Symmetry: D2
Subunit: 417 residues, 4 copies
Amino acid sequence: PNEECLQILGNAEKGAKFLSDAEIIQLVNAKHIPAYKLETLIETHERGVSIRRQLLSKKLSEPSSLQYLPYRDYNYSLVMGACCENVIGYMPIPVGVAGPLCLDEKEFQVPMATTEGCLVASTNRGCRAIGLGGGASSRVLADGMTRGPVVRLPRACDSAEVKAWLETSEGFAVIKEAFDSTSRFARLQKLHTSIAGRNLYIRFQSRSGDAMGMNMISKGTEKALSKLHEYFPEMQILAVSGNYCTDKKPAAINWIEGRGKSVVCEAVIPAKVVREVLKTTTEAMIEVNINKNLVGSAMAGSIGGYNAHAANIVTAIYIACGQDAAQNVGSSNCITLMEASGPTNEDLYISCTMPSIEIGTVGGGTNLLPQQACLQMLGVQGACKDNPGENARQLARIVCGTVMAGELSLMAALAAG
Amino acid sequence: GAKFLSDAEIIQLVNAKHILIETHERGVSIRRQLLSKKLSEPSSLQYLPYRDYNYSLVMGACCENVIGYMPIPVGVAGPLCLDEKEFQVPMATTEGCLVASTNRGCRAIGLGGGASSRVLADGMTRGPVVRLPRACDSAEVKAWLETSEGFAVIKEAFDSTSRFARLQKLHTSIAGRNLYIRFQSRSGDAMGMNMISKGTEKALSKLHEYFPEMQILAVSGNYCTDKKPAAINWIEGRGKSVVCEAVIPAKVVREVLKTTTEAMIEVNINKNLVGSAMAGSIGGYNAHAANIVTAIYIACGQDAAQNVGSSNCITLMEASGPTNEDLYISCTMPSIEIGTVGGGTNLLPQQACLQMLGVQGACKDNPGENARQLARIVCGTVMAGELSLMAALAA
Amino acid sequence: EPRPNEECLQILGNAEKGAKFLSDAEIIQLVNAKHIPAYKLETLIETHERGVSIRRQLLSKKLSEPSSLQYLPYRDYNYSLVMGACCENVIGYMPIPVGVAGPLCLDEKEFQVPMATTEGCLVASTNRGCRAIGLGGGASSRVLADGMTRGPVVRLPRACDSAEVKAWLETSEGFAVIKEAFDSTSRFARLQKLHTSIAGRNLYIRFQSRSGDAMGMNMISKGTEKALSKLHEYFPEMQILAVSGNYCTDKKPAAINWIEGRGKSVVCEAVIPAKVVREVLKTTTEAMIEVNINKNLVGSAMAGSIGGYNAHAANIVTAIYIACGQDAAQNVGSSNCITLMEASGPTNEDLYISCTMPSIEIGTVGGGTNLLPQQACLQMLGVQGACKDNPGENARQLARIVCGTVMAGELSLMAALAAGHL
Amino acid sequence: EPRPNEECLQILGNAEKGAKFLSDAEIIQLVNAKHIPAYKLETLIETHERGVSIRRQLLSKKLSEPSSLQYLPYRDYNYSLVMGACCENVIGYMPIPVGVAGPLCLDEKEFQVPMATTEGCLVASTNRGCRAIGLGGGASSRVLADGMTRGPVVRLPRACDSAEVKAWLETSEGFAVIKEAFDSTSRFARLQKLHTSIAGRNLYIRFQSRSGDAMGMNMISKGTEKALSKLHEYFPEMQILAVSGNYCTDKKPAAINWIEGRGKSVVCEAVIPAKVVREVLKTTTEAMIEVNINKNLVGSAMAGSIGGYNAHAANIVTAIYIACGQDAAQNVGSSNCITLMEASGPTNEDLYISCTMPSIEIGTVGGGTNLLPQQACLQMLGVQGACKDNPGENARQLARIVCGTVMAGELSLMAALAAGH
Ligand SMILES: CC(C)n1c(CC[C@@H](O)C[C@@H](O)CC(=O)O)c(-c2ccc(F)cc2)c(-c2ccccc2)c1C(=O)Nc1ccc(S(N)(=O)=O)cc1
Ligand SMILES: CC(C)n1c(CC[C@@H](O)C[C@@H](O)CC(=O)O)c(-c2ccc(F)cc2)c(-c2ccccc2)c1C(=O)Nc1ccc(S(N)(=O)=O)cc1
Ligand SMILES: CC(C)n1c(CC[C@@H](O)C[C@@H](O)CC(=O)O)c(-c2ccc(F)cc2)c(-c2ccccc2)c1C(=O)Nc1ccc(S(N)(=O)=O)cc1
Ligand SMILES: CC(C)n1c(CC[C@@H](O)C[C@@H](O)CC(=O)O)c(-c2ccc(F)cc2)c(-c2ccccc2)c1C(=O)Nc1ccc(S(N)(=O)=O)cc1
């Protein structure tokens, strides 16, 4: 009944919990109730998902499309008004595990969410060679998420004035105070700027504790630019990101300046281990690395893509561990080097250098519990109380270390043919 | 067999190195318990779900040492009015507001009479590196591959390996005695990596016959280029090269997008062109194409690591209409790497999202048309994403 | 002494008098107060040199230090081949010292390579590279590709229309019509496969063709214009926005030139005996390879280079280009080079070296190669002017010489850096 | 009259005679008989021009056409400033025509810009661009950054050690010890913040400093060599692999030069009224923006350019570089330019134009600027040699003049592309 059902919705202590599935759907189709009124009216999250699927399904060319998209018994409360909207369900990505990865005297079992055949198996083989080689070592070389707004002044002489002002000790200090006032972990490092006529691109860089820090840095960037407006009232803020960050697009600035964590990792693989585990020789590995990862990438016109498949490992760890998998674009930046080592140049020195690993252990997908499980496997879930940023640094080191395992195994598979 | 043993006992054997199980879901349980013994926090696994998932479609083709699955929330943006049709576009993401913003982009496009798209090129690639004794020899091979007779014999060998192996023009570059060879072929509705690899191996094997001193150094010399940033994918395309466009009436930019045509053009020029230029970008002349590509790719069983190149996009915005107040927007994405059969599209949840869009599996009438359609959907939804985010930045 | 402007104009407009019957003071007087603007001085003054002399006197009064031009030479230079062709508002010439590096043993021949440069030691260093190559049996090179390009941008009303034009150009019959219009413009105009790129309703079209021994810019542009006119017959709503849309790409760095080639794409190589690397180059093979990998490959990669995987190819390209009447601004793309070094031979102690240069933009007819001094340098190499019995051979040979001299230069400088002064 | 070889040698080794007492034919007879190496002619022959003359006679006999050097001039040129400084094995000089575009109205001054080129209409076209700027009220420019660089590669035993070295150079005291070493080598050496990059056990170190009015390669390199010697005292396992590891980056295309700058980073701007755009440039502001956006931004984007967002900056950079005694091979990076074009005024009919050139590598002291003809062109612009009272001002002014003349070039070519035919 259409007019009885409205009575049960309007009563403040009854609610739509008393109504049925088809009755709420009869209301919308008759146009008694608009569609957008169902988000706010319906009580529980899972029933909101159910009714959206049903409404959505009748509009589809094949109304049975959603049959095998699962949606029941998922914690939508951590996702609603925080991570996803118009939610009709969830997508299971198989999670495999590669390890142990022997990195800086610890051992890691690395979760990898992927649907590419053999990626975990191959990565795990690279892990095996590293462990039988005495483990890999890594260092975090730099740390600071960025945002890169574009501002505009009337003339290029003015934009130049502002650049010189931001380069002074006094002007930087003023901007630093306004940026840092927005948050606990927001500490502004040296500003990088570029002029293009009357445009001025300003790359704000700051650590962000254990968060990846896109939201924190943005908040700092806006207050900092508000303070900059007080010194330069004619300055227009065109966009809070003018693509100079650069976020989720290939850019040499991230390659050269770094973004998020800049990391290096390295290991030596005995000749014996290269033969028995990797089914090739040190000399063959080197020849392939030089001519694939340097020369080949060079011929193809690569900026920052001097590696075999860093992106595969970055992406799978990112999906498993609640990262922004779109940031695989810049986070997969990697140069993989290989050279002969040891008494008779028969052992394999390998290193991966990844200048822009954009990563966090708090916020975003890491609020969700399956994603926290994977972060917990690695011992890096959430914030680190004693050493703010140490969980995010550790995960970045794991990523780089795991990328190196991936590089060893794939580069060996290609070398053996 | 194993059904009479217990979980605690079978692990006893694998630990002792004296060592399959009769049910897929139990194989996952026992793997979780083996892994569990190696972690400092074994209870970390308890909220990583694993039950009642169809592991049969995974075991052999997709993933090894599987211990569960990672649920990614799926949202829907649409209807996206694209080429006289309506699509409800699934987007798997954990990024706040990404679906809502994309959906707004869709709303603006529909009220502007919808978007139009064309597939400009189509062919996955693979770019092996080979070596000859001398640069004079590598050059002889290049010359030979550029003749009609040479290309035809390399084509016959490539094409013999499978149904959809149909070799297009070759692209080669020499680096001294190295020769990089870029094979491009369509691949039915599959993304086509395995297919083009098999075609490449038999083609390189046939090239070895003409040049026995040639060394096949690696079936991928990074000249493809797969999953790394490369100008070659931007200039030559890879997979589907696609263009999409729409005109958004002035009032619609005002009321829906909360800005103006003029302000939008000013941000696009100075962010997506000039800004990306100052940043030293090749192919990243867009706001956030990667957000949409990645979200759709995870939802639709694509290889999410191919967002590196699939996200390549130039977003252009011009003034339009008689009064010059309407917003012409286009997105050009020359390297969308995509398929509707194989990989993660073999799993039922991922197929649900492909079925939403009406592109699931092979198009039996016209091989490749579902993958082509999906690329067009990706490019149209990227343009929707560009519209909304650029409006939010300009406002 | 100078008589009034009125009388000076009557003598100027008389056929049997002209400018020969006036003073320097009097020509300068007419210019200072219009009647003669300044650029018309070339087509009015008795001789080329007096036109240059007068232009200098005009300029000198405008300067802060009037005697600035004292040591800028101008007398007795053959300005006839310059005027209307190479340069306007000419006040003189700039002497660039020319040294010789050689013999360069390339493809079983010997070359004495002229290099116009002011950088100390460049010719000496390059010359040592030639010697190391000579003692190692010499270099070999092949020309891989040959075609100068021009990359106009056109526009259709919509992206779907530009898509239609791309597909039409990709059909055999569409390209054959465009090729016919292109090729009708000159005897050397032969259009190769078209490269096309869409950016919304924009459509960049890369026209490529050999061009005899000319570098070919003017010829290609002419071919391009007739090709687009014909294209407009089929697609009347097409607008030519610019005859170059930076898609060629000329005189700017661009991945397309690196990947597709432009002008002449060349490869060169040589094996240097271990003995020679030690004695001549003061280093070892092992050391050279380590420096090359970690400087020219890894270092160039960390700096974010496209096409710059070399030590100083640009030094050599520029010196040969100025010496040989080339367009030195084309150093931008023509310097593209990847230098590779590896172990070779029985001992694995000999140095294999190769230099691959995909975009050497060059020619032996036209532009600066019309002037006799730069023809002298071209004649040194045996590549001056057009080749009658094999059109394009001289420009191809010059491209090979450039790539081989670059390799010579790479060998030497890389050995200097590898030794570290020692 | 030509004497036997043994007789000619005693004359050559007689200290109160020498080669001055031999004829050309005798000196050649000695070279051909392998008594004198051909390269030692420079230090044996008393006059520089005679050394050039004999090198030419020797060279001509090696050529397939012996008269090929006829129209290569060599006489009455001042080889004294070139020998052992600018060029070796010298057989003459190459005259490049010099034209003048101007006046360039820049920062309330006027410049007559010399351009050594052989490309037809380049000077005339650039000169049209100058007219538009001057009738548009002039151009204004700013040097934004100043510092030549050198980017050596060193190697440590492990990547962990390269990381240790990077962190050490990033502390204020580690940097200060390196800065003290670097600054000690020359009066203008002032080491700026160190930019470093790791690749495994490689460490690339980008040393940047002002260099007076010199372009500064040799100076920066000398400071770099001494700075690395100091760093070796703290890290004795460090290997200096190469004083240039291509991270500078000198004379190759590189994003690092685009993003960080190198030498002089400059920006230039003008507003061109519609009337001037009409009469001088023969077009409209609307047409020029449409061409600039779709050629210099979008076109360069599709071509995969880094730093090549301009029409023909390189033409102007190269022409001025040759005239003014610069290193013309550095036009690779010095030509880096993004040209921007906007509508201004009430009906979008005035043309705001700017050129941004982040890496103008230039000098007015040293190299080819030591030669008198090259100094004449520097003197034309008022930038010859070192500025005593304001060190670096001449080099800074020249880089502004390049950027401003580049903008002039951009205006004219783009206008011509916007019209047709
Ligand atoms: C990592 C994955 C699994 N993988 C890929 C696909 C990698 C792509 O996703 C990225 C590349 O396209 C990037 C690039 O190189 O340009 C390939 C492969 C790459 C390019 C080809 F043309 C063909 C095959 C190979 C491979 C297999 C054989 C011989 C050569 C290469 C493997 C590979 O690593 N398998 C493996 C190893 C050990 C074990 S084991 N025995 O340890 O379990 C199993 C499988
Ligand atoms: C699309 C996403 C959700 N989004 C992002 C994050 C996008 C990043 O993941 C990619 C960028 O970093 C790439 C780049 O531009 O460099 C931002 C944003 C971007 C850069 C900042 F510095 C700060 C915030 C914005 C935004 C919000 C406000 C004002 C300006 C920008 C939005 C955005 O589109 N929200 C939105 C719009 C409508 C509705 S509605 N009214 O339809 O529901 C909801 C949310
Ligand atoms: C070719 C030129 C002359 N040349 C240059 C300057 C080359 C620049 O124009 C381009 C580089 O900057 C490009 C780069 O590497 O990034 C340098 C040099 C390069 C970078 C430095 F940091 C310092 C010095 C060297 C050099 C000398 C010694 C030790 C290391 C390098 C030489 C060089 O080749 N001299 C030489 C050799 C043999 C004979 S001989 N004995 O054969 O006549 C003479 C001179
Ligand atoms: C500057 C030079 C002289 N110039 C060039 C050649 C410039 C090349 O050296 C570099 C370009 O290739 C870079 C690029 O755009 O990709 C061209 C030209 C460019 C691309 C073509 F396909 C064809 C012709 C043009 C031109 C002529 C006509 C119509 C359009 C463009 C001119 C040009 O500026 N002439 C002129 C102007 C005023 C006066 S006046 N009347 O003031 O004296 C004379 C001549």
